[PDB]
């Protein structure tokens with residue numbers, strides 16, 4: 001059987017036939033579900049089976065399955081693997097593969113956009129200095145003076161006999177987190193480790209709550225090299241609230257461009273350890289997680305006090321009221337600055353449209369309910385009432401160990 | 405083999421060793437996770453479940469393997485040889501009811517699991533006696549608004565005989581009436597049972613909060629219609645502490661959440677009629693029942709009264725209206741002196757339960773999607789807690805509708 005999947009708002013029913021194609025295994029068993037875990041995980045013949053599957057996907061996408069070109073590319077990959085132990089993607093295959101990896105990412109609510117992705121081919125990159133040039137070009141294109149455009153830059157693939165390219169930073173733009181001696185943190189606690197590594201590698205630190213980190217860039221078989229981003233390249237949004245004028249005096253800001261730089265991109269059995277990608281923010285990422293998580297900036301109580309809320313009892317719902325107003329400030333501030341942002345209602349609505357498209361196109365869509373449902377207002381969004389099937393398809397974005 | 409479980413707010417690590425004991429199989433496989441599905445499940449066997457429950461029982465009272473332990477085992481064997489089933493002792497039933505609550509992965513209120521009043525109704529015959537047992541349960545559990553958790557256990561399923569069943573999904577439900585513009589006056593969830601009460605001879609109301617009659621079914625008989633005495637059904641009119649117009653919306657909800665359509669399984673025995681009640685968490689009423697698009701769906705009405713900008717989602721009018729409805733629910737129950745818990749207090753208590761259960765049993769089955777509240781998810785501590793979901797017995801299970 002194929003899993004039956006129900007939308008409880010509408011009563012509609014589908015069957016996820018795509019999940020039967022899932023190859024790599026997740027952490028669940030019939031005995032117990034581990035769907036809530038953040039980390040679900042941790043050769044010529046196996047390489048070829050993955051390469052063949054990918055080539056088949058490519059020729060399907062362009063409606064040329066079983067063509068002469070399809071058969072000849074399969075044979076051509078077979079011969080390169082037999083000769084050299086590996087192979088190279090065509091340019092067209094790289095573009096398709098990166099879009100597919102995005103399409104396949106189960107925790108991404110933004111996948112209505114998956115076919116609109118600018119793919120920068122950096123597979124000729126030969127040094128950390130040239131890496132930095134590719135990255136600056138990526139940031140300039142993607143930022144586009146606030147009219148954000150999705151993009152990925154793909155650095156050379158992993159290969160035996162040479163180290164990996166790696167970007168040590170988790171995102172291209174991140175705020176420093178200065179671990180204080182009391183155990184407290186000035187800045188973003190999520191970035192304490194990379195801040196200390198930047199210092200250890202010669203960066204002169206600041207002492208602000210929103211200090212932009214330098215990049216630690218690793219070329220093959222080299223220690224990371226420190227590069228500072230041009231200030232003119234890093235677009236930031238000061239946070240203000242449309243009706244609470246004192247909010248501006250909190251001195252809060254966030255950056256325009258979310259650009260994840262520490263995930264591994266896998267295409268047809270080839271691995272790209274350095275392949276940063278960027279899109280635009282959903283406002284709850286900044287307003288709810290980044291600013292209100294107890295272990296991040298943790299501003300909820302400060303705002304609630306300023307709002308004159310009764311923070312002495314849970315039943316006043318002061319936390320909920322303060323969080324709503326912080327999210328309003330984020331949205332208002334980005335819209336005022338003319339920087340692309342999407343609220344969680346519009347994002348989840350577009351994701352429901354994506355599920356319907358993917359049901360027609362492929363018979364299902366891998367989706368991680370706990371990550372698709374926003375961190376506030378969950379059941380006020382349509383995805384809350386939509387059952388979802390989580391599984392791993394390739395091409396894929398994957399977690400990888402930190403390189404230090 | 406023992407899953408590692410992390411809290412991402414605090415960094416602490418535990419290992420769930422209890423999941424190794426999971427008796428039945430869930431819907432997930434290494435190929436694909438089906439954790440988000442509401443319904444995960446579509447002689448000699450009775451004895452083995454019966455045996456292992458008796459073993460559980462004696463271990464929990466520190467009488468493991470001793471003298472009375474062997475006597476009870478041999479009694480159940482002789483019982484099933486003669487009759488094809490067996491009888492629980494009253495204390496085994498109490499223990500099994502509490503364990504089934506303690507084991508329920510989707511219940512955020514399990515800090516309370518050790519405090520449960522068990523009404524033994526296994527001597528019941530006829531719907532008229534069911535109705536009397538149910539009325540006594542409601543009166544006890546409501547307790548003038550100082551709610552007390554209770555379960556009434558009706559006779560078990562046996563071979564060659566029908567079941568007792570409560571056709572209603574809860575003891576207190578609001579009617580849902582269809583109209584010729586497609587829509588529903590009342591609760592859309594209860595349209596089916598509303599027309600069943602009408603079919604079996606109930607004169608319907610015309611309100612949005614008409615309390616339904618009870619449809620009680622004794623074995624091998626049609627169900628019988630019973631009216632709940634109005635003074636037995638404690639309701640709470642909803643008002644807001646500062647929005648004076650909120651009262652004029654005419655919203656109400658009832659005090660006692662009393663689930664009456666789930667099956668209780670203990671030692672291989674099955675009780676298809678075993679209603680249980682606790683008290684509400686505020687988001688159940690204010691977010692799910694009142695704001696779900698397929699329930700009362702009042703969110704846009706409240707937002708319009710609040711003069712919010714409903715033409716763009718980016719004003720967050722839905723979020724603001726939701727918070728004030730939840731405020732109204734909390735204020736109204738507290739003013740009426742009816743027990744209620746807000747989602748912040750409830751999730752903090754469930755974290756304490758997780759710590760207690762780690763020490764007691766080495767883990768605790770928990771369904772993240774149902775434990776995290778439907779508003780302000782990440783503002784509660786359970787959001788950042790990884791959880792392991794698995795099926796233990798004794799258990800509460802879904803069952804087919806009697807029709």
Ligand code: HEM
Nearest residue numbers: 102105107108109110113150151277278279280281282397
């Ligand atoms: C264009 C607008 C986009 C929006 C609004 C969006 C939104 C999101 C959000 C809210 C998450 C959850 C992240 C978290 O909670 O940390 C996510 C995850 C993810 N996104 Fe998207 N995204 C967008 C574009 C992209 C693009 C262009 C890519 C890759 C080409 C991408 C790939 C991913 C991946 C791989 C994850 C999973 C991360 C993980 O598992 O930790 N997204 N996205």
Ligand code: HEM
Nearest residue numbers: 505508510511512513516553555680681682683684685800
């Ligand atoms: C005393 C206060 C209690 C509170 C605050 C509470 C809270 C909750 C909540 C919020 C849910 C989610 C239900 C939904 O969203 O539809 C739930 C589920 C559940 N509760 Fe509790 N509960 C309480 C008492 C009890 C008792 C006394 C029992 C049984 C003896 C029980 C057994 C269950 C079961 C079996 C479920 C699973 C429901 C399902 O899977 O459909 N609960 N509880």
Ligand SMILES: N=C(Nc1ccc(CCNCc2cccc(NC(=N)c3ccon3)c2)cc1)c1ccon1
Nearest residue numbers: 038110257258259260277278279280281282285402
């Ligand atoms: N578990 C650890 N932390 C940990 C693990 C996983 C995560 C997931 C964070 N994803 C950041 C992210 C990913 C994808 C999309 C967005 N958002 C966009 N809008 C966007 C970004 C690019 O395009 N669009 C944001 C975060 C922290 C850990 C601790 C030590 O080591 N690891």
Ligand SMILES: N=C(Nc1ccc(CCNCc2cccc(NC(=N)c3ccon3)c2)cc1)c1ccon1
Nearest residue numbers: 442513596660661662663680681682683684685688
């Ligand atoms: N199966 C159908 N829907 C369906 C299926 C499952 C559910 C789950 C709802 N559980 C109700 C419930 C269960 C447990 C606790 C509470 N709350 C308490 N606080 C409480 C109650 C008693 O003690 N404490 C509420 C709801 C609807 C269906 C389809 C067609 O028709 N019906």
Ligand SMILES: C[C@H](O)[C@H](O)[C@H]1CNc2nc(N)[nH]c(=O)c2N1
Nearest residue numbers: 036037038370371787788789790
């Ligand atoms: C324990 C839990 O899996 C973890 O906190 C998850 C829950 N869902 C999430 N969902 C999103 N979008 N982002 C997250 O970081 C998380 N964290």
Ligand SMILES: C[C@H](O)[C@H](O)[C@H]1CNc2nc(N)[nH]c(=O)c2N1
Nearest residue numbers: 384385386387440441442773774
């Ligand atoms: C699709 C999804 O599983 C479904 O809507 C679930 C999600 N989580 C829930 N959580 C609670 N507490 N109650 C529910 O009814 C649900 N519904």
Ligand SMILES: [Ca+2]
Nearest residue numbers: 080087088089
């Ligand atoms: Ca070549």
Ligand SMILES: [Ca+2]
Nearest residue numbers: 583584585586
């Ligand atoms: Ca008509």
Ligand SMILES: [Ca+2]
Nearest residue numbers: 711712713714
């Ligand atoms: Ca207006």
Ligand SMILES: [Cl-]
Nearest residue numbers: 258285286290
């Ligand atoms: Cl982020």
Ligand SMILES: [Cl-]
Nearest residue numbers: 661688689693
């Ligand atoms: Cl309810």
Ligand SMILES: [Gd]
Nearest residue numbers: 242243244245
């Ligand atoms: Gd003001």
Ligand SMILES: [Gd]
Nearest residue numbers: 708709710711
């Ligand atoms: Gd007015």
Ligand SMILES: [Zn+2]
Nearest residue numbers: 028033432437
């Ligand atoms: Zn699972």
